[PDB]
Design a protein around this motif. Structure first.
Motif, PDB file in Angstrom:
ATOM      1  N   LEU A 136      87.132  -2.207   6.473  1.00  0.00           N
ATOM      2  CA  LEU A 136      86.027  -2.847   7.172  1.00  0.00           C
ATOM      3  C   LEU A 136      84.655  -2.185   7.068  1.00  0.00           C
ATOM      4  N   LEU A 139      82.203  -4.028   4.713  1.00  0.00           N
ATOM      5  CA  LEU A 139      81.529  -5.230   5.193  1.00  0.00           C
ATOM      6  C   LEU A 139      80.452  -4.935   6.244  1.00  0.00           C
ATOM      7  N   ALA A 140      80.313  -3.668   6.629  1.00  0.00           N
ATOM      8  CA  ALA A 140      79.341  -3.265   7.652  1.00  0.00           C
ATOM      9  C   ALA A 140      77.951  -3.891   7.537  1.00  0.00           C
ATOM     10  N   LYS A 141      77.406  -3.952   6.328  1.00  0.00           N
ATOM     11  CA  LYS A 141      76.082  -4.522   6.149  1.00  0.00           C
ATOM     12  C   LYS A 141      76.079  -6.055   6.223  1.00  0.00           C
ATOM     13  N   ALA A 143      78.251  -8.236   5.870  1.00  0.00           N
ATOM     14  CA  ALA A 143      78.967  -8.897   4.778  1.00  0.00           C
ATOM     15  C   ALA A 143      80.228  -9.617   5.254  1.00  0.00           C
TER      16      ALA A 143
END
Ligand SMILES: [Ca+2]
Lengths: 183, 175
Positions: A136, A139-141, A143
């Protein structure tokens, strides 16, 4: 018959790019195996939208045939080199949406080049990511990772797709969407 | 959360990213909070079936008077089975999540085919659980505002037009 292959290819490219990918004008979209049915449909729709098209293909002839369509990039689908080649081409920005159909290290590499707000769309069969997982932090930005299985969608929402297919055909019929050829 | 942060977060997560549709089922955790309540308001406007979660009796009682499909406990993870049981195994179409740990894993597990799990909060994710045309999206409003201030400034005007038109009834935070 050849009427189903076209529908299946355009319904998948449209649903993936317009509804799930939110592909908007000027965004960068990476389309793997662009010479395939779904691939050329995605390129075609991408040109309608006005996105920056980055592609990938397995042979010289197919790659050469993509560069004639006037795309900003044509990489090797049998390689992972595309990730660095694209980062180098965009000075590190990367891509906004990735239409993926490749297996292996390509999935990880594809996610890694998503710019903030990026959308990764998995079209591969359940066996390409079955026992796999996603950290995970990738996907922080802002995403996202979206799997699209058109065969399943058709069964669950037959009516919603029949209208989308008329919707697409109406676009082609009236010239708002140009169906790009192979050779 | 202020009005701007609440509605921008909720609208961008339920409408743009989530694609909430009339009749779809949406699970909104900690629904009595700012973002949570803006989320319930937008769901109401859309016509979605609402499944909620709150951290106390007083808060759950407040959610119940709003007239929703379910009001579970956010300090628990039981909400997963309670919803599967309540929805006859269908699960939920979209999950607006701000809870942590198991709530996420369990929340992804109850997505219906075509489900969209929007993570507002804050740790790997098994991809097999996204097999039936599901997705997982992380929404970071602060980052989004910094990168596309104009796009968000315009989205706020779009939202405010709905409020002014009487289309989007803004439910007050009963806190
Ligand atoms: Ca360089």
């Amino acid at each position: 018959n050849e009427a189903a292959t076209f529908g299946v290819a355009y319904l998948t490219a449209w649903h993936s790019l317009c509804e799930v990918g939110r592909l908007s004008p000027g965004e960068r979209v990476l389309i793997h195996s662009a010479t395939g049915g779904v691939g050329m449909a995605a390129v075609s729709i991408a040109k309608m939208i006005g996105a920056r098209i980055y592609t990938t293909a397995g042979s010289d002839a197919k790659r050469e045939m993509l560069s004639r369509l006037g795309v900003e990039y044509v990489g090797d689908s049998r390689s992972v080199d595309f990730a660095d080649e694209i980062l180098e081409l965009t000075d590190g920005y990367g891509v906004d949406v990735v239409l993926n159909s490749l297996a292996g290290e390509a999935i990880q590499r594809g996610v890694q080049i998503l710019a903030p707000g990026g959308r990764f769309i998995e079209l591969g069969k359940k066996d390409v990511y079955a026992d796999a997982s996603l950290g995970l932090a990738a996907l922080a930005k802002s995403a996202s990772f979206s799997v699209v299985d058109l065969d399943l969608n058709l069964k669950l929402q037959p009516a919603r797709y029949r209208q989308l297919l008329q919707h697409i055909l109406q676009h082609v019929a009236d010239g708002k969407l140009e169906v790009l050829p192979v050779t």
